[PDB]
């Protein structure tokens, strides 16, 4: 099996290495072997087939053995829509879906714009001439403010999730370290639940608690909250990171926006295709034997790893796929998945990034990297795709 680098040191080379194996390749993900699939046609078929599942408990025979030794166990051990199959998935997703409907996201625009303006205004107060780490001053705080408002996370409890959600995506942690991070996360989650139970509000956390106190099990409640909070605290940060970094390293693209040839939305869509926030998605399983394009077989019970980043650059899908081009007529990508599990937060994330870009470049037209010659290393993760820091000069 091809061993995927847990430190995510060079994902671009990784894309090529994986695609070198054809539509699918047997790989090793921190000790677990699975079929990495990067052919978008095949991936879309697998993602819409009744023969593929995200329910490890029901469809992965090795689950019982893996759960105690795999550092990424939390990704497949939770009990929420992320690990549900069929009717159970429809049920667990429908409970949260309402908060992310088209009408709801549109209704949140004013609040999100205000949050964006506040963070950008703050940047404007920073000492002129001194470098600013945009990842820490804008990319990270915006998604947190949005999810906090939507989920109803008390202000005094927001910082507590930061290091823990980071741990969820830290694929360099060993089993013991991952287990400790997970325990700490459930602890702050239980505390949040207790606080919201005592003082409910007009938010999703309160609605979920209400559903559990009515069905919804104790595990489904905390695990659904874990999913929603983690999704809001990480991932979007990387899209903002990548979009800004691209515009600062590819001036022609920013000029296209200023000329009115492409929109901020177009830039976000190309960023999602070219440098998606989630490179690989653990994990799926074959409910029955599945034939691969080369005659090989994904045996019943074997894992399937959706390799979205590599797939978004597949040469039969997009021409000159490795080049960032916001003018592309065909903008489809798999950054949010495909099918019933399609990212529930997609519309909100898209709005967050488009608004952030507009406000940021609108306020600082001379924004630029603090040091273009400085190499910005990637976040140490096989899953998350972002820079450890994004040093810029506002004026
Ligand atoms: C507003 C912030 C976000 C929220 C609340 C959110 C929420 C969710 C939820 C609830 C799911 C599970 C859906 C299901 O299994 O039915 C999900 C899945 C997913 N999300 Fe997000 N998400 C957010 C941002 C993002 C971003 C920025 C990306 C990457 C550009 C992303 C990528 C994905 C992917 C790849 C999946 C899995 C698709 C699959 O099942 O293969 N999400 N998200
Ligand atoms: C665990 C599983 C999924 C997620 C996620 C979904 N969308 C963004 N992050 C975060 C933690």
DSSP string for residues in 142-158: HHHHHHHHHHT--HHHH
Residue 274 CA to residue 105 CA, distance in Å, equals 25
Protein residue closest via CA to atom 9 of ligand 2:
231
User: What was the structure determination method?
Assistant: X-ray
* Cα end-to-end distance, the chain, whole Å: 49
Task: Identify the DSSP state of 252.
Answer: H
User: Do residues 117 and 145 lie in contact, with contact meaning Cβ atoms separated by under 8 Å?
Assistant: no
Separation of CA 372 and ligand 1 centre (Å):
32
Q: Is 82 in the pocket of ligand 1 (CB under 6 A)?
A: yes
Task: Identify the DSSP state of 363.
Answer: H
Residue count of the chain = 395
Exposure string over 311-324, b if 16+ CB within 10 A, otherwise e: bbbbeebbeebeeb
Helix, strand, or coil (residue 66)? helix
Stated as kind and residue range, the H or E segment containing 298 is strand 297-298
Residue 220 CA to residue 209 CA, distance in Å, equals 10
* 300 has binding-site annotation: no
Separation of CA 295 and ligand 1 centre (Å):
32
Closest CA to 55 of 82, 22, 21: 82
In angstroms, how far is CA 237 from the centroid of its own chain? 9
Pocket of ligand 2 (CB under 6 A): 82, 168, 227, 230-231, 235, 343
Ligand nearest to the Cα of 170, by number = 2
Ligand nearest to the Cα of 143, by number = 1
What angle separates helix 346-363 from helix 102-125, to the nearest 10 degrees?
Answer: 30
Q: State the Cα angle at 354 between 350 and 357, rounded to 5°.
A: 140
Residue 238 CA to residue 367 CA, distance in Å, equals 18
* 280 has binding-site annotation: no
Q: Give Dmax over CA atoms of the chain in angstroms.
A: 62
Q: Could you tell me the residue range of the domain that residue 150 belongs to? A: 1-395
Q: Which atom of ligand 2 is nearest to the CA of 234?
A: 9
* 308 has binding-site annotation: yes
Ligand nearest to the Cα of 166, by number = 2
> DSSP alpha helices (H): ranges in the chain?
11-19, 40-46, 56-59, 63-66, 74-77, 86-94, 102-125, 134, 141-151, 155-169, 175-198, 204-212, 218-233, 236-249, 251-259, 264-274, 308-312, 346-363
User: Do residues 274 and 320 lie in contact, with contact meaning Cβ atoms separated by under 8 Å?
Assistant: no
Q: Write down the residue that tokens 């999100």 correspond to.
A: 112
Phi/psi at 210 (5° precision)? -60, -40
Tokens coding 220 = 């489904």
User: Do residues 385 and 279 lie in contact, with contact meaning Cβ atoms separated by under 8 Å?
Assistant: yes
Tokens coding 253 = 């693209």
Phi/psi at 36 (5° precision)? -85, 130
Cβ neighbors of 110 (< 8 A, separation 6 or more) are: none
Residue 201 CA to residue 151 CA, distance in Å, equals 9
User: Do residues 54 and 46 lie in contact, with contact meaning Cβ atoms separated by under 8 Å?
Assistant: no
Separation of CA 219 and ligand 1 centre (Å):
20
Tokens coding 267 = 């830039």
Closest CA to 185 of 168, 204, 206, 172: 168
What angle separates helix 264-274 from helix 251-259, to the nearest 10 degrees?
Answer: 150
Closest CA to 280 of 22, 23, 27: 27
Ligand nearest to the Cα of 333, by number = 1
Residue 190 CA to residue 13 CA, distance in Å, equals 41
Phi/psi at 387 (5° precision)? -100, 145
Residue of 144, 242, 343 best suited for mutating to test ligand 1, as the one with most atoms within 8 Å of CB: 343
User: Do residues 53 and 25 lie in contact, with contact meaning Cβ atoms separated by under 8 Å?
Assistant: no
Structural domain tally of the chain? 1
What angle separates helix 218-233 from helix 204-212, to the nearest 10 degrees?
Answer: 170
Cβ neighbors of 243 (< 8 A, separation 6 or more) are: 267, 268, 271, 353, 357
CA dihedral angle for residue 349, residue 352, residue 357, residue 362, rounded to 10 degrees = 160
Strands 32-37 and 303-306: parallel
Report CA-CA distances (Å) from 184 to 159, 161, 190, 235, 272: 13, 9, 10, 20, 31
Tokens coding 325 = 């081009």
Residue 89 CA to residue 91 CA, distance in Å, equals 5
User: Do residues 46 and 283 lie in contact, with contact meaning Cβ atoms separated by under 8 Å?
Assistant: no
Cβ neighbors of 94 (< 8 A, separation 6 or more) are: none
Residue of 93, 331, 336, 342 best suited for mutating to test ligand 1, as the one with most atoms within 8 Å of CB: 336
Separation of CA 315 and ligand 2 centre (Å):
28
For position 253, which CATH number holds?
1.10.630.10
């Amino acid at each position: 099996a091809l061993v995927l680098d847990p430190t995510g040191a060079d994902h671009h080379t990784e894309h090529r290495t994986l695609r070198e194996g054809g539509p699918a390749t047997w790989v090793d993900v921190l000790g677990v072997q699975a079929w990495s699939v990067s052919d978008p046609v095949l991936l879309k078929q697998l993602l819409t087939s009744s023969d593929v599942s995200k329910d490890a408990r029901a469809h992965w025979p090795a689950f019982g053995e893996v759960v105690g030794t795999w550092p990424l166990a939390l990704w497949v051990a939770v009990e929420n829509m992320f690990t549900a199959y069929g009717p159970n998935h429809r049920k667990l997703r429908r409970l949260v879906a309402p908060a992310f409907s088209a009408r709801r996201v549109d209704a949140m625009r004013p609040a999100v714009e205000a949050m964006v303006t506040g963070l950008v205004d703050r940047l404007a107060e920073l000492p002129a001439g001194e470098p600013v780490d945009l990842r820490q001053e804008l990319a990270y705080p915006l998604p947190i403010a949005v999810i906090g408002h939507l989920m109803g996370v008390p202000q005094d409890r927001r910082d507590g999730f930061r290091a823990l959600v980071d741990g969820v995506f830290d694929t360099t942690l060993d089993q013991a370290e991952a287990q400790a991070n997970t325990a700490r996360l459930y602890e702050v989650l239980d505390q949040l639940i207790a606080a919201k139970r005592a003082t409910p509000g007009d938010d999703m956390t309160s609605l979920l608690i209400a559903a559990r106190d009515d069905r919804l099990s104790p595990e489904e409640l905390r695990d659904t909250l874990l999913l929603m909070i983690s999704a809001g605290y990480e991932t979007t940060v990387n899209v903002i990171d990548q979009a800004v970094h691209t515009l600062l390293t590819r001036p022609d693209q920013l000029a296209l926006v200023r000329k009115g040839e492409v929109t901020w939305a177009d830039v976000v869509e190309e960023t999602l295709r070219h440098e998606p926030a989630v490179k690989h998605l653990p994990l799926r399983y074959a409910v029955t034997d599945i034939a691969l394009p080369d005659g090989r077989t994904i045996a019943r019970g074997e894992p399937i790893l959706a390799s979205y980043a590599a797939a978004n650059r597949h040469p039969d899908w997009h021409e000159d796929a490795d080049t960032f081009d916001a003018t592309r007529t065909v903008k489809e990508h798999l950054a949010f998945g495909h099918g019933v599990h399609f990212c529930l937060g997609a519309p909100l994330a898209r709005m967050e990034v488009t608004l952030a870009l507009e406000s940021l470049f609108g306020r600082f037209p001379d924004l630029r990297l603090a040091d273009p010659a400085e190499e910005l290393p990637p976040v140490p993760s096989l899953i998350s795709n972002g820079h450890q820091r994004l040093p810029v000069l506002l004026h």
